[model samples]
Every structure is written in structure tokens, then in C-alpha cells.
Target: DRLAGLPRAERTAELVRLVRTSTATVLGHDDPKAVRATTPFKELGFDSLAAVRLRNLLNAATGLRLPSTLVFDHPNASAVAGFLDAELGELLEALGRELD
Candidate 1:
């Protein structure tokens, strides 16, 4: 599987890219990395409506339905990545199929 083929650092980088791109699209920003660094989702001027849209997009991409509270709880890529890594046991299980 792609995930298994990636090194840990590369996997984290890929996740960051995925998050940044998705966030940029949902927030209508042209530059994802710049927006990510200076103005995060909350600091970038996202309101409740935009927050919901972001959550929907995140869920669709990650297959994990993060709560709306993620806006307040996880406001950055690093935090979100930590959360995903913690919850990624299922992903590992899925990847194990490739070994079999």
C-alpha cells in the first residue's frame, strides 16, 4: 500500500499536504502553505459555516468524522496530524492486507 511504502517523515509530509490543500480549497485560499503558517483556519477568518464545510471535507478525505469541536480543539496541521496518527491503527490494519 502507499502508506506502507512511505517513510514516517514522508507520510507525515503527505498528510500535511493533504490537510493544507483541503483546507485551502474549503477556505478559498490560493496559497495553502502561506495561509497555514500565518493565518490558520480560525485566524484566517473562518466562521461557523466555513468550519462545517471544512469538517465535511476532512471527513471525506480521511474517513474519520472529526467533531465540529475540532475547530477549537485541533486548529493546526501538527495537532491534526497527531490526532490522525493516534487514530491510525485502522489504517495500519488496512495496509497489512498488502503483506498478506
Candidate 2:
């Protein structure tokens, strides 16, 4: 594979970390947030309302259309990130093959 890797996963990790830090500082969600590499969304101190909020936030962050059922879909932030990463990777790979 010419493409060794991509940045969506890394960016996702950074984004999740920032979310935890900012939420603790601004949203008063306390500290020691679920900033783990594979912490589930349900374990991230969130409910139905908060679920959509984070989902929309991720949608904007990834700069691509995203799923809405983030509440019951993916297991963790890593899974979500991997999903997007895979989706984006396939699209990019397709485009690369097409251009040649």
C-alpha cells in the first residue's frame, strides 16, 4: 500500500482530548474524563442530548457528513474515528485509482 496511514485517527484522538479538557474547563463536566484511547461514548459522561451534541461536533470536526445515531452505534471514540477514517480512506483510494 502506497499510503502507509492517515491523520483522521490522530486528529480524532486530539479532538477527543481537547473535548475532555475543554468540557472540564468550560462545561463544568469535571476532570478525569473518558479520554482513553478506546473509551465508549456512553462512558464519556453523556446522555441522549449530549450524544447528539458530540455527534454534531464530530461532524463539523471531520469536515464530512457523519452518522447521526452515535448514541447506540459505535462502541468508543476510537471506533467512530476508525469508521470515518475507513470511509474517507476508501473514497480517497477510489479517487486515486480513478485519476490514473
> Per-residue CA lDDT of candidate 1, range 1-100, in tens?
1365666888777777877787788777667766563345677777889878877888988787778877668777677766766677478988888998
Q: CA lDDT of 96 in candidate 1?
A: 88
Give candidate 2's error at residue 43 in angstroms. 2.7
| TM-score, every prediction | 0.72, 0.55
- Score candidate 1 by TM-score against the native: 0.72
Q: Pick the candidate with the highest lDDT.
A: 1
Model 2 worst lDDT run, 10 consecutive residues: 19-28
Candidate 2: segments with Cα more than 4 A from true spot: 1-34, 90-100
Candidate 1: segments with Cα more than 4 A from true spot = 37-39, 90-100
